[PDB]
Amino acid sequence: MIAEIYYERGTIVVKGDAHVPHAKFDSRSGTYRALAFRYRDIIEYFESNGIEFVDNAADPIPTPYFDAEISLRDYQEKALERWLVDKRGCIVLPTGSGKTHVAMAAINELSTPTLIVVPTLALAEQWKERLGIFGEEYVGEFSGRIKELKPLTVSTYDSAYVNAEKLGNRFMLLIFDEVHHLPAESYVQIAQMSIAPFRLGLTATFEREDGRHEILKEVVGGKVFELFPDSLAGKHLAKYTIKRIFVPLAEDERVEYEKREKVYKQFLRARGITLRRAEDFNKIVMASGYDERAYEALRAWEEARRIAFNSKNKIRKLREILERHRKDKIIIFTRHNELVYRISKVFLIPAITHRTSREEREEILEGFRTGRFRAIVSSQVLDEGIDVPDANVGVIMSGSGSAREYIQRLGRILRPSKGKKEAVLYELISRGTGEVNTARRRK
Amino acid sequence: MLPKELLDVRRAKGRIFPKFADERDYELAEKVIEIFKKGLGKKYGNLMKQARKLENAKNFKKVRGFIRVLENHCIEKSCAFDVDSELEPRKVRMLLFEHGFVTSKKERDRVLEYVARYFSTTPETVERAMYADREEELILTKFRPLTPDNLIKLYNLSLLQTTLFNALRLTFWASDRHKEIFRSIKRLGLMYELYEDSGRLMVEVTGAATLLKMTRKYGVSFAKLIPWILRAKNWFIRAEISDFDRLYIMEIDDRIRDLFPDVEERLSYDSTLEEEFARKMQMLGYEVEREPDVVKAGKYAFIPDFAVNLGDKKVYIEIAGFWTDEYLRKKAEKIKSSSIPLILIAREDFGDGGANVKDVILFSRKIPYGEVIKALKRYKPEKKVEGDVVELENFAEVPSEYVIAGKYAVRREIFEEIKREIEVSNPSTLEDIKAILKKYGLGESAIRAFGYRVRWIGLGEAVIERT
Ligand SMILES: [Cl-]
Ligand SMILES: [Cl-]
């Protein structure tokens, strides 16, 4: 007496609900079925409209939490951000190590079973060599040569097509290299038959190639970022890379967050609303008004976001980054004044908030200009008015794109240190608590 | 002044109206004032805490907006605090920060024990003193009473002007106080365009607030115009605010004047951004007569800042600060159309650098009093239509200065040919250069440019005769 979806031969068959979208009744089966790539739309339906269900379709390959610190260029970081909005779509890039790196960063961030699909077995070997960074323990190949199911499996369109069924329900992230190969009527079955919610296609071609770019948007998603080699050969490559660090919530912090997380999430889906950005919940609760439990929702959400940004772990991660850069100049930046002062107390770093006087502000910056203070923690210095002294390393505690442009501005003032080639702009991102999967002992 | 997150607004179909506070809200506003009054000697954060326990599902948007606005006012204007420490927090923290940065408990303790030894104290006292002058750690000593009507009126003013800070552009009308509201516009220097349209004898004014660059700098001076507006007896304000896919529009009226505080002309602690109008009217006063206190407009309306006195007509000048490429092109096409002087000088070092204007443009720098003075010296008073000065030129009127010369002007090519003819023919006598030059356009006082000075080398001087 409960809805359940299960996987079979490249399709999802649903039993227990009939309004499930894209489902079609197979009179032979007696049950509704759809193409497996409708997984999201079906999973979204059950959780948006609050139908509790069993998931016997997804059988992910156990995958660790990857905290490789994949270094990206600015526009490559920009590319990653634009993809992550949907986590389903396509990118074009000038170079090929740039394509991989972006794919490499996305895999690092998502930490789910991932299937790369390339045209040729040469590439397949180049991907799986690049993917060594996450540990060859977790890299594998599934093609004619060998058939092994690792957290990071590389295959070819040809062997994936012949094997679309056995590969459908076992990865969460689906990467297509030189994606314009995908629209062939055989290769589309690769996409149409995997439940993989997240989909990245990498290419360099144009949007006018026989009209088959139309089927991509339906099965992988359409372009989210474009940059062809001519726009690179005209601008100077900024002298810094942007690494992303993923900091887990501690256990008790994850305990309390999930509490406040449950109250706001239960209230929002009870409403059934689709929030574009979490900041609109500060304002949607005011304008709508006429609600008693919406305060209790806002109070939990506000309480939840505060548990997440003050993460004890993020300051420990900042502690580790600071040891790593004892000789360099550093600007740490968040948007939370309490955190600016907390970082200052813990590590004895000058703080500059908007409550700082123009005297001490200019003192700090002149002492950072000279060798008197090797670091600053601040929530103002990236403003358009004042000019920051040069530095070698930036940290963004926030990690998020509430104010995305700050990541650009914080890059602007970075310069490589004496003895090293280029600078670094870390950004600390709060991801998981542990307990992601098993040890892959099955079969 | 009030944060855009904690904004209490009614979201209409195509409109947006701020849910202002009124006497229905007196009782609350009194309750949040009383614990600041009754909590002298209390840590200012703990009062902040109490005031926010008075928060519930119905009042939260405004009991929080109250605490914010009262907090600002108390802090900035109407309160005095004590730091709950024997140590000066700036001293403690600079000595701490001067001892590098620490990445471990162990070296952190070393520097604390080091600073504690210096201040003849314990490390815990040093750790407390570090940021003891933070608002929430301060001790409230003197809160002067606010009447809850005051707080409510302030809340409405900041709530009004924070909505406007988020808007793209706004247009209004004012019955009285044009001049001083105008002067407030100019010192604030927001880009403007005044229109005598949709009304009679009514100047309608427009100005933008949601820019791409420096959006907050002038976003925070934009809302600094509004109390001068609200200072007139009548006003009809509408604005265009949008951060969604679509736009909302609000319109507030002078009938709401009873919801905002009374603010006479503040006019304190500034030069009013009239650096040039106040000091370089004197630099220009040596060259011509000037008047910084100007009020003028043509068929349409443009706000002058300075005036250049020429006898035929005067030259208006504007010295606004803010600018943008797309926003300057509209104000610039109007100055030439109406044929008004309207001298314009902007800040090329403060705004963003785009494409400078083709005909009329002025750049600025650290000391740009000359960079625009180059284009400005060319006041060009009626220099578009100029007649031929070759002949006529009041010839009948008076030939008193008409003895200079007699006939046409030479051509550079022909002049270059005669020069080439003169450099090679080898003349050494007056009677020798006269014949070579008389063949084409004879004239004695015409060796002006050939580099020859005629000289009488004989005994005595050169005689004359009557004609
Ligand atoms: Cl079928
Ligand atoms: Cl299972």
Residue numbers in the entry:
A (entry chain A): 3 to 445
B (entry chain B): 1 to 467
Extract from the study:
Xeroderma pigmentosum type B (XPB) gene encodes a superfamily 2 (SF2) DNA helicase conserved from archaea to human (1–8). XPB plays a key role in DNA opening at damage sites and coordinating damage incision by nucleases. An XPG-like nuclease, named Bax1, has been reported to form a heterodimer with XPB in many archaea. Furthermore, XPB and Bax1 nuclease have been reported to work together to unwind and cleave DNA substrates resembling NER intermediate DNA structures.
The crystal structure was determined to 3.0 Å resolution by molecular replacement combined with anomalous data obtained from an isomorphous crystal of AfXPB complexed with a Se-Met derivative AfBax1. There are two copies of the AfXPB–Bax1 heterodimer in the asymmetry unit forming a heart-shape. The two AfBax1 molecules interact with each other through the C-termini, particularly, the β-strand loop β-strand (βLβ) C-terminal tails forming two pairs of anti-paralleled β-strands. The two AfXPB molecules remain the open conformation observed in the AfXPB crystal structure. The AfXPB–Bax1 complex structure reveals that AfBax1 exclusively interacts with the C-terminal half XPB including the ThM and HD2. The crystal structure of the AfXPB–Bax1 complex reveals that AfBax1 consists of four domains: the N-terminal domain (NTD), a central domain (CRD), the nuclease (NUS) domain and the C-terminal domain (CTD). The NTD is mainly responsible for the interactions with XPB: the β-hairpin and the first tri-helix bundle (α1–3) interact with the ThM domain of XPB while the second tri-helix bundle (α4–6) interacts with the HD2 of XPB. In contrast, AfBax1 reduces the ATPase activity of AfXPB by 50% instead because the AfXPB–Bax1 heterodimer keeps AfXPB in the open conformation and hinder AfXPB from forming the closed conformation required for ATP binding as the C-terminal half of AfXPB collides with the CRD and NUS domains of AfBax1 when the closed conformation of AfXPB is docked onto the complex structure. Interestingly, the inhibitory effect of AfBax1 on the XPB ATPase activity is removed by Y-shaped or bubbled DNA substrates, which allow the AfXPB–Bax1 complex to have higher ATPase activity than AfXPB alone, suggesting these NER intermediate DNA substrates activate the AfXPB–Bax1 complex, in agreement with its role in nucleotide excision repair.
